[PDB]
Amino acid sequence: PIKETDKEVVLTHPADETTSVHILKYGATVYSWKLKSEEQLWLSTAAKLDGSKPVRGGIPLVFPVFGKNSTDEHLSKLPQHGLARNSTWEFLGQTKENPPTVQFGLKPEIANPELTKLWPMDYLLILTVELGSDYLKTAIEVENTSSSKELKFNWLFHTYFRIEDIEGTMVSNLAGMKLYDQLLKESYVDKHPVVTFNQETDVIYQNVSAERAIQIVDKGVQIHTLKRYNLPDTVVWNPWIEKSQGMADFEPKTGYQQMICIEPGHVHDFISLAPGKKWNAYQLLCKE
Numbered sequence: 627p628i629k630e631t632d633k634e635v636v637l638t639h640p641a642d643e644t645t646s647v648h649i650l651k652y653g654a655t656v657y658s659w660k661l662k663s664e665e666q667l668w669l670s671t672a673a674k675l676d677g678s679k680p681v682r683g684g685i686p687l688v689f690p691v692f693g694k695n696s697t698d699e700h701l702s703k704l705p706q707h708g709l710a711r712n713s714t715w716e717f718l719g720q721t722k723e724n725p726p727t728v729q730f731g732l733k734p735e736i737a738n739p740e741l742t743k744l745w746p747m748d749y750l751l752i753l754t755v756e757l758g759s760d761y762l763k764t765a766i767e768v769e770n771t772s773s774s775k776e777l778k779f780n781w782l783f784h785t786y787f788r789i790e791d792i793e794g795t796m797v798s799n800l801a802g803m804k805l806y807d808q809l810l811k812e813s814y815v816d817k818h819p820v821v822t823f824n825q826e827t828d829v830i831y832q833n834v835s836a837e838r839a840i841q842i843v844d845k846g847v848q849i850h851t852l853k854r855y856n857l858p859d860t861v862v863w864n865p866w867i868e869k870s871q872g873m874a875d876f877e878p879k880t881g882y883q884q885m886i887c888i889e890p891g892h893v894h895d896f897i898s899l900a901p902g903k904k905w906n907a908y909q910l911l912c913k914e
């Protein structure tokens with residue numbers, strides 16, 4: 627079933643109503659995904675869900691810029707991670723009952739007014755969210771609705787996976803891939819057979835195709851599987867102790883122990899879309 631309220635849309639799977647996803651209209655932000663009653667995503671206990679600021683947890687949507695830009699006249703004007711997660715999207719309706727599937731839209735006319743004034747480029751975004759019995763798919767289409775100007779942008783899904791204990795967690799299937807390390811400010815090949823975590827981690831892997839599934843492992847069990855289409859980059863992030871302590875909406879302060887962000891996107895460079903052209907991609911979460 628599909629249920630809309632003033633603030634959000636909630637999908638529940640017809641075959642098992644304890645499998646669900648909650649999507650806040652603000653940012654079209656998925657903030658809970660339960661698989662047979664078990665929460666898959668991390669959400670801060672101090673996360674704002676009231677539209678006052680972006681949600682600390684779930685799946686914030688990052689567009690038209692990842693991180694902070696300082697090289698482009700217009701993109702440099704925006705706050706870190708852009709304006710999609712700061713805007714209230716329109717619920718466009720359901721498109722399927724089983725699997726329950728719904729769409730959200732964004733265009734400048736309904737976006738964050740302040741940020742739209744700073745980056746007055748034309749676009750249409752359509753997010754499609756599909757809740758399967760054992761997966762969650764979040765798909766995006768971007769259309770350049772300008773008749774004259776190119777549209778230049780990044781796209782990333784800022785997925786917060788929920789885990790039991792960060793220090794017991796490993797991430798597999800990134801061995802031998804090139805990354806840019808946002809902390810060390812250098813690029814190198816990951817020579818470790820799996821990714822492990824014992825300090826702040828902020829890295830951007832490159833050249834991940836539709837064929838490469840990334841697995842999150844704990845006690846020899848695959849607790850999450852991430853697949854994507856048309857998003858060659860993967861940000862892997864955990865703020866660790868000090869950065870968690872510094873984020874006012876991040877609670878509890880030990881909560882970095884229960885999250886890992888594995889974020890598929892197109893962020894290594896900008897996509898440029900000619901007038902009237904479209905780009906699309908998706909993230910597919912499951913538990914293989």
Ligand SMILES: O=P(O)(O)OC[C@H]1O[C@](O)(CO)[C@@H](O)[C@H]1O
Binds near residue numbers: 693889
């Ligand atoms: O606090 P936010 O603007 O949501 O950003 C959170 C994180 O996003 C990243 O750029 C990648 O996850 C990190 O460096 C960290 O800043």
Ligand SMILES: [Ba+2]
């Ligand atoms: Ba940062």
